[PDB]
Each structure stands twice: as structure tokens, then as C-alpha cells.
Write a protein that binds this ligand. Structure first.
Ligand SMILES: O=C1C[C@H]2CC[C@@H](C1)N2CCc1ccc(Cl)cc1
Lengths: 191, 193
């Protein structure tokens, strides 16, 4: 009942904020999209931002699931190639207009830098650390502190995606950032 | 007139010192006016609210940060662009570890300015020095020819994340030394020199 209200509201908000952005859609329009009364909604979420926080969580899960089930589809033979696939996977997925609007444009404003880092690192650190660990185990990456390299790589890839998202010419920004990330990764790795 | 100009400077200096020591959250504007030796009225004429005064403090602290970074690189005796990049990475870790820069720039600024405001300030003060350093390394053949603005923006995301990671760490001394190792390995892997 509570879970079904929550699910209906998250799906509705994810769709409409996805299309027009957080700032353009009010909570009552979301309630109607969800087939929920203002009252049922305010009982599950104090305000707009609180609902936005559950939308971010659900979108980040999908984004990480999409990326894992895209690296697996790359058929990378080594950890080094899996890191390269994972970088491409993130450029592919952050180019999704919903991920661009909710995660790259609205999330930083609504959550702030501290909040966004918490969410970003809650969802990506483990996958990033695991990928670094495998490259070390295979001799393709120098033994080196794993958590700090992971943190830095996630700051770079998040910033890469934000640079593309707000570029005058995103098609050009993608191809140029892709060249830059390929050089950064090739400079991080062993051969 | 001249007293209005002196009030502005006194309030920025006083707010910079007290917010530096205790956070933005822990010092009200009345204690800042007293520290400055001026009236709430002279203060409200120069700054509409607390946040407005905080924005002038951020500007003055960022100027000191970039000046201290340029000083540290020039002081390193770096003969090449590659060595200047090595100095500049160390200089950023050194300067962001200053407790005033940690409190005002890493913890308070993103909250008080918000995302758009803070990014605009951060980019205004760091992009130019970062782009210039990359350009020199390319001109010297010590860095592969590549798009300058995108490499700069990626590197700034890495260095900003590095600084935040150390600022909030359980063991900042360890975080600094380990992040320093990782950044140095990354750039030693890109630099032809
Ligand atoms: O929702 C997400 C996607 C973005 C934005 C927030 C955080 C988790 N970010 C992770 C970006 C990332 C991290 C590691 C790798 Cl290998 C690739 C990409």
C-alpha cells in the first residue's frame, strides 16, 4: 500500500523530471501521473527533494546494472579491456537523456556536492575497486592504493560526463573526452 | 566613503579569520561586525546578508590559493612543463590541506554557494592555470597533442575529488600520501618526461 504509493510516485517523477527536469515539474502533477492524492504523496514524502532522493537511488541502481550488463556484453578478455569497456559503458549510459537530466544536471543542484558524492560513491565504488583489484591481480596495473585510485577515477568520469552534458556541441565533446579518457586510462595501465 | 571601503576590507578579513577557525555555521554576522569594529548598519550597507559576505571571502581565499600554487611551482625549480605538472599536483595537495582552505572552500563553499555557484568560482580560478600547464607540455612534446579543455576538465574533476577525499578521511595523513602516489603514477604514465 505504502510501497505501491512510493513505487507509483517514483516511476511518475522519474518519467516527468526525466523529460522536463526537476525545476519544471511540481509534486501535484507527479501525484496525478502516479494516480495518487496529494495527501497519500505528502504521507510518503515530506517535500519535492525527498522524492527526488528516492528517484536518484532507483536511477543509479539501473545505471550500474546497465553498465555491468554492458561490460559483460563487451566480451573483454582482460581486466584492462574491462576497465576500457566500463569507461565506454559510462559514456554510452550518461548520454541517455533521462540519466543526463536527473543525474548530471538536477542531482548536483538538489543534493549538493556532498550528497551527490555520497550517492555516486555508494553506487560505483565497489564496482570500480573490484575492476582495479582484478587489473592488479592480472599484473596489468601496478600494486597501488585501491580506494584512492577508485575515488580519483570516479571524480574524473563523473566530471567527463558533466563536461559532455553541458557542452555547446555534445557530439564533439563526447568524441574528444573519449580520446582524453582513453589516454588517461592507457597512462594508468601496464603493457 | 573611504570609511565604507575600509569597512568592506575589515569585514572580509574578520569573516575570513573567524569562519576559517570555526565553520560558516558557527559564526553569526554580529560577532563578525564586532571583530571588524563596525556597526551592523555599516555591514548591512556593504553586504545584503551572510552568504553575500561569504562570497567575497571565497574570492579572496581562491586568489590566495592560486597565488600559493603558482609560488610553489616557481619555487620547485621545475625546468620542464612535465616537472611543473609534478610540482602543481603536489602544490594542490599541500594547499587544500591548509585547514582554512579545507573549511571555507571544500566544506562551506559548496553548501553556501550551491553547486552552480561553487563550480563557476572553482572553474574561474583553476581552468586557466590547468590549461596553460597542459598547453606547455604539448608544445614541449612532453604530452600527446589532444583536446586541451577536456583534459583540463577531467584533471580538475580528479584533483577536486582528491582534495575532498583527503578533507573527509578517517586518516587524512594517510589519504594524502596515498592519493599523492596514485596521481603521481597516473601523470608519470601520460608524461613523455
Ligand atoms: O549513477 C552513477 C553513474 C555516475 C554518476 C553517479 C555515479 C554512479 N557515477 C559513476 C560513474 C562511474 C564510476 C565508475 C566507472 Cl568504471 C564508470 C562510471
Amino acid at each position: 500500500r505504502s510501497a505501491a504509493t512510493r513505487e507509483a510516485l517514483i516511476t511518475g517523477a522519474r518519467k516527468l523530471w526525466g523529460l522536463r527536469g526537476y525545476a519544471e515539474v511540481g509534486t501535484p502533477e507527479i501525484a496525478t501521473e502516479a494516480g495518487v492524492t496529494r495527501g497519500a504523496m505528502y504521507h510518503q514524502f515530506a517535500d519535492k527533494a525527498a522524492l527526488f532522493r528516492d528517484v536518484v537511488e532507483v536511477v543509479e541502481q539501473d545505471v550500474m546494472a546497465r553498465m555491468a550488463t554492458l561490460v559483460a556484453a563487451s566480451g573483454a578478455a582482460t581486466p584492462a579491456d574491462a576497465i576500457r569497456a566500463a569507461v565506454d559503458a559510462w559514456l554510452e549510459v550518461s548520454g541517455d537523456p533521462e540519466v543526463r537530466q536527473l543525474i548530471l544536471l538536477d542531482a548536483p543542484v538538489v543534493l549538493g556536492w556532498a550528497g551527490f558524492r555520497d550517492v555516486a560513491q555508494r553506487y560505483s565504488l565497489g564496482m570500480t575497486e573490484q575492476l582495479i583489484t582484478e587489473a592488479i591481480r592480472a599484473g596489468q596495473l601496478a600494486r597501488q592504493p585501491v580506494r584512492p585510485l577508485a575515488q580519483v577515477l570516479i571524480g574524473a568520469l563523473d566530471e567527463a560526463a558533466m563536461f559532455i552534458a553541458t557542452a555547446d556541441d555534445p557530439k564533439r565533446a563526447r568524441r574528444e573526452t573519449r580520446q582524453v579518457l582513453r589516454r588517461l586510462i592507457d597512462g594508468m595501465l601496464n603493457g
